[PDB]
Amino acid sequence: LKALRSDSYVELSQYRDQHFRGDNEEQEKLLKKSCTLYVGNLSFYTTEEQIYELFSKSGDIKKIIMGLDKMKKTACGFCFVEYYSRADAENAMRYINGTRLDDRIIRTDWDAGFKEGRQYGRGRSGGQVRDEYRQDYDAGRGGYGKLA
Amino acid sequence: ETEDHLESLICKVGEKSACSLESNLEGLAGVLEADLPNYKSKILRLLCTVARLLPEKLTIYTTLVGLLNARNYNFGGEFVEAMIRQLKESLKANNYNEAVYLVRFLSDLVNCHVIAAPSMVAMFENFVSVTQEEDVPQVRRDWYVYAFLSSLPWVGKELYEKKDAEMDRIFANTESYLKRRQKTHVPMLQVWTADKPHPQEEYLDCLWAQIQKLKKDRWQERHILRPYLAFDSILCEALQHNLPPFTPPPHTEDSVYPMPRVIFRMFDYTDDPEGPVMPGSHSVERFVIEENLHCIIKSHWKERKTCAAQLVSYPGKNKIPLNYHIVEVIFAELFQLPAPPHIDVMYTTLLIELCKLQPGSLPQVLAQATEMLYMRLDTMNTTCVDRFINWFSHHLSNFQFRWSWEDWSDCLSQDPESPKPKFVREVLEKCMRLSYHQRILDIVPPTFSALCPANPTCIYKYGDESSNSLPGHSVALCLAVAFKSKATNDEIFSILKDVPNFNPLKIEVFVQTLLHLAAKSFSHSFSALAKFHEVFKTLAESDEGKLHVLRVMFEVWRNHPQMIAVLVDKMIRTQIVDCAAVANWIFSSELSRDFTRLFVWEILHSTIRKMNKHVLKIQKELEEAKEKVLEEQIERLQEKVESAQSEQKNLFLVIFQRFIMILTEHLVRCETDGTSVLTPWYKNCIERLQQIFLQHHQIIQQYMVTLENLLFTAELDPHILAVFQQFCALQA
Numbered sequence A: 001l002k003a004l005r006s007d008s009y010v011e012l013s014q015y016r017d018q019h020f021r022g023d024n025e026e027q028e029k030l031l032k033k034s035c036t037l038y039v040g041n042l043s044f045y046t047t048e049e050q051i052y053e054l055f056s057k058s059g060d061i062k063k064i065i066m067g068l069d070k071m072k073k074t075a076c077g078f079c080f081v082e083y084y085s086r087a088d089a090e091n092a093m094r095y096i097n098g099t100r101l102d103d104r105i106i107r108t109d110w111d112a113g114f115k116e117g118r119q120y121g122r123g124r125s126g127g128q129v130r131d132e133y134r135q136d137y138d139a140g141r142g143g144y145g146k147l148a
Numbered sequence B: 001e002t003e004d005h006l007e008s009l010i011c012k013v014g015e016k017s018a019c020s021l022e023s024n025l026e027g028l029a030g031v032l033e034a035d036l037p038n039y040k041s042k043i044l045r046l047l048c049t050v051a052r053l054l055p056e057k058l059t060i061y062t063t064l065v066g067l068l069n070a071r072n073y074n075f076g077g078e079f080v081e082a083m084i085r086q087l088k089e090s091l092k093a094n095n096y097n098e099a100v101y102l103v104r105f106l107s108d109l110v111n112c113h114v115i116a117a118p119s120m121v122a123m124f125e126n127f128v129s130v131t132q133e134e135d136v137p138q139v140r141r142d143w144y145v146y147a148f149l150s151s152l153p154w155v156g157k158e159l160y161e162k163k164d165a166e167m168d169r170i171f172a173n174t175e176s177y178l179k180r181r182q183k184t185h186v187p188m189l190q191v192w193t194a195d196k197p198h199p200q201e202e203y204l205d206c207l208w209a210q211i212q213k214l215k216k217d218r219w220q221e222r223h224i225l226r227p228y229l230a231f232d233s234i235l236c237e238a239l240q241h242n243l244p245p246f247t248p249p250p251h252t253e254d255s256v257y258p259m260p261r262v263i264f265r266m267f268d269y270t271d272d273p274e275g276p277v278m279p280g281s282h283s284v285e286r287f288v289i290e291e292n293l294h295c296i297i298k299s300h301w302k303e304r305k306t307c308a309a310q311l312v313s314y315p316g317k318n319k320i321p322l323n324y325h326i327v328e329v330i331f332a333e334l335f336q337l338p339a340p341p342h343i344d345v346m347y348t349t350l351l352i353e354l355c356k357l358q359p360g361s362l363p364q365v366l367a368q369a370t371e372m373l374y375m376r377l378d379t380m381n382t383t384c385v386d387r388f389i390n391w392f393s394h395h396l397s398n399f400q401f402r403w404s405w406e407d408w409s410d411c412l413s414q415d416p417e418s419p420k421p422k423f424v425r426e427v428l429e430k431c432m433r434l435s436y437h438q439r440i441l442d443i444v445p446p447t448f449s450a451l452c453p454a455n456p457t458c459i460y461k462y463g464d465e466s467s468n469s470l471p472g473h474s475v476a477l478c479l480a481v482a483f484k485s486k487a488t489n490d491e492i493f494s495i496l497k498d499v500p501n502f503n504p505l506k507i508e509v510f511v512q513t514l515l516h517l518a519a520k521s522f523s524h525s526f527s528a529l530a531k532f533h534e535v536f537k538t539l540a541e542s543d544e545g546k547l548h549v550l551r552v553m554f555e556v557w558r559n560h561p562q563m564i565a566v567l568v569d570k571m572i573r574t575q576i577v578d579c580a581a582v583a584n585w586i587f588s589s590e591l592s593r594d595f596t597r598l599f600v601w602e603i604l605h606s607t608i609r610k611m612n613k614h615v616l617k618i619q620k621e622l623e624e625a626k627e628k629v630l631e632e633q634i635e636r637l638q639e640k641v642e643s644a645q646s647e648q649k650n651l652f653l654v655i656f657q658r659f660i661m662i663l664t665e666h667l668v669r670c671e672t673d674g675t676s677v678l679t680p681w682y683k684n685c686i687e688r689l690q691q692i693f694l695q696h697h698q699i700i701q702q703y704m705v706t707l708e709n710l711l712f713t714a715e716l717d718p719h720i721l722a723v724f725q726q727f728c729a730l731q732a
Ligand SMILES: C[n+]1cn([C@@H]2O[C@H](COP(=O)(O)OP(=O)(O)OP(=O)(O)OC[C@H]3O[C@@H](n4cnc5c(=O)[nH]c(N)nc54)[C@H](O)[C@@H]3O)[C@@H](O)[C@H]2O)c2nc(N)[nH]c(=O)c21
Pocket: A015, A016, A017, A018, A037, A038, A040, A067, A078, A109, A110, A111, A112, A117, A118, A119, A120, A121, A122, A123, A127, A128, A129, A130, A131, A133
């Protein structure tokens, strides 16, 4: 009944897919009813096998789509995990988000839904945009940012 | 607005203030009275809510209902009116755990001069009276006693100032009742069967023993904070009320009562020599401390960070080894049989959040507990061990797999089947699946290498065999060629038409080949199954076919358990095989050597859940469709429910028949060769049967007629029956 309802880990993030079609209203309606998650900060060598093992801890996974370099077609450092039920996705959001996957801290976000073309880095150079300007060194994402 | 502000303030008092609690209760007291004219209903609602949802705050709010009753008799009378109504509802709806918090809130009100001390006694006398009730489940007679005893830590002291006459005659009927209860369920609920170091006691016996130490101590406990203690000046002259005659609701066929429990215990004051003395196992302080901690987790389970914080800041009247209580209570929940209150992975990250909050003291205790758990492994229940493995391996992966493995060197020279070495082997296997083979070989010492997991490599039969005397060999070679060429189903069918014998040989060459050419990733094998899905549905149109697929797939991937699991799952969901076949596969002779490994059961339970989920889904659809062409559907949804439930019952039927068959075979052989019945194999097998009951007792209940009269009958060995009878005692 009261504020015990607090579920901060399940709340919508600030991210919004700029290539989505509908309003921000249509993207938000999908996000609050989604069963698919965006997973960020993976290493380029984190496998689908590892993702399956960690994310299955919160419920049965239906499909996993690895993010790829649009032009090189190699692991990009992100992925989409889709559950059969939202209750299971919420729990991944609640207890898996912010923990270690293949030795690195990952972050999950609700996703409107997979669609052909969502698996490619939108990064100017092919990988993820995030990596174009990174000013930190990351041996799991190819060293320094692209502008370096 | 205002509505909003009230709820905000009602919560503020319970929360950690920045000005003595008594002050806030003083203030909010008036504020609420001032608003009674206009906001009587809301404040009456808000309080009845915090009463059943914030037990860990029990005494902070009872006080409040007191200061108020000390400024508006008629108000208190209304609150107490709601509470009873609110309590009658929770009871009729089978929400007994919520009731206890109500029944306990009333109790403590007596200490706040709001309810007539004698009044409470009259109700409890009626609770215990349930023990006399004829032809009612023991779990029912149990709940009322528990509701009664669990209150005494709060009411008992003053409830002893009066009606000692009946407040002795109640203990009398209790004692009598407590000694007449059957305890058939204990063996099935204990985390450990060893009596040492710590006995795992039935929950009512443990509480009974707890009340005693309190009574014989003149009902003077030293933990339960009582704010209504610093307000005697006011509460004194307050006018108490009288709870109406409470007649417990009649046991109906729709009643469902909490299952009995066993108290998890792993710590004692000697486990923390240099720390505030830990309340003993039979002290009410222990009960109350774990109760509040359990309730805190229940209130914040969805937010891990808030949760750790509410735990770590727990307010204890007198200092206690908090960190130890927090770890003990979390493991108490993870290892609770039949099931934990919350999703398993929650405890893992909850513990992580606690380690980040008390970097300087929590980790050592958590490291101490891990050590202790490992050393007591020999008698831990299989279902808990699994839980232990998954927790520890997942935990390690968040701390770079850093652990002092040599501390567990003793396992190295034990039968590989013993609980300790097996536990290490399984933990390591799990660590590999969260990373990779080589990484794990690198974390453990050279001496442990033997327990490391095998490299998860594919095993092609007609592969670089060069051993071609095998049937269908060439046929397989054509398949390999076709697949790599983007062949079509019909083409593959053609290649298969050249196979000499449901055709076992066709299956084997197809599977062996299809899997080998998709052995690079899970996603390849999946699409592989999806593309040539039609072939599968053909070769395995029969149960023998279904069973043979599973047999060849296992032959191919026996070194990669995680692959086997995801494939079986995918096969069931795409109907290439069904649960019955998976069940027969699990008990097949081809798996006899891997029968006690975790992945075997992880698969069987994942198959059972898919069946259950499926049943539930169709039932709901019918439910919705029934709540409205629209007919032709309900005709169809009915048929689907039928089949779904029928196939579900059959799955449990086969699983049980198989268990009975292999357990009897063992029991007989032993009782003939005069050999020990208690072998490692037996332990896993008997405890795996028990687990079937634990995980799905709800569904299984629907088969009582068949189970009680057709399968688990008297001609069965008592060792097997025992498991059944324990199960029945859960709702007896
Ligand atoms: C980060 N993220 C990606 N996807 C999906 O994964 C694919 C990969 O494309 P990206 O190539 O990963 O795509 P974008 O995010 O489209 O663009 P962008 O939003 O601009 O933004 C931010 C990352 O780039 C950085 N960035 C962008 N522009 C600048 C700039 O001008 N300067 C600097 N310094 N940094 C910038 C910034 O720090 C930021 O965090 C796409 O299909 C996405 O839908 C996400 N999906 C969900 N649900 N939630 C997310 O949080 C999420």
